[PDB]
Amino acid sequence: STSDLIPAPPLSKVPLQQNFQDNQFQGKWYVVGLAGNAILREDKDPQKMYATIYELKEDKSYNVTSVLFRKKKCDYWIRTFVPGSQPGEFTLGNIKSYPGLTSYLVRVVSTNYNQHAMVFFKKVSQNREYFKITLYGRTKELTSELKENFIRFSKSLGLPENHIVFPVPIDQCIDG
Structure with a gap:
């Protein structure tokens, strides 16, 4: 009653980007596509594009900073x-600081590093299993081919069309 979610796909259905180059994945990515079992299309108040910056630390973990525009201000979360079991996979550091969070997995599905990427996320929060796929763009716009591929991949993981959104480009916060 409290929550009905589309099940997380088995990891076997989520490809891994072969020969993952952590240094090349660094920098700002625009979230041009967003899909998941907690993601719902909202025509009345469409999701605004946000940005996510990846910076490698000395120990080769990523400092991941996301910036979004809401309530007339830029909100940052770090x-x-x-690094996880293999190149392109990651887990969340300092999991204890997040209340109710018992699991968090990141897998880079595909990328050419200089234009686009698809990243799979899976987490367990309050014993509920959530997953999402982000279509990362180096620019705010990507080709119809790449967006259609994202839709196709999202659907292959069991997500319907209304759980797949393409955030509207904005200039506030994410241009820096």
Whole structure:
């Protein structure tokens, strides 16, 4: 009653970007596509584009800073992605600081580093299993081919069309 979610896909259905180059994945990515079992299309108040910056620390973990525009201000949130079982996979650092969060997995599905990327996320919060796929763009716009591929991949993981959104480009906060 409290919550009905589309099940997380088995990891076997989520590809891994082969020969992942952590240094090349650094920098700002625009979230041009967003899909997941907690993501819902809202025509009345469409999701605004936000940005996510990846910076490698000395120990090769990522300082992950996301910036979004809401309530007339820029909101920043910082996460740490720690290298996982194989290149392109990560787990969340300092998980204890997040109340109710018992699991968090990141897997880079595909990228050419200089234009686009698809990243799979899976987490367990309050014993509920959430997953999302982000279509990362180096620019705010990507081709119809890349967006259609994202839709196709999202649907292959069991997500319907209304759980797939393409955030509207904005200039506030994310241009810096």
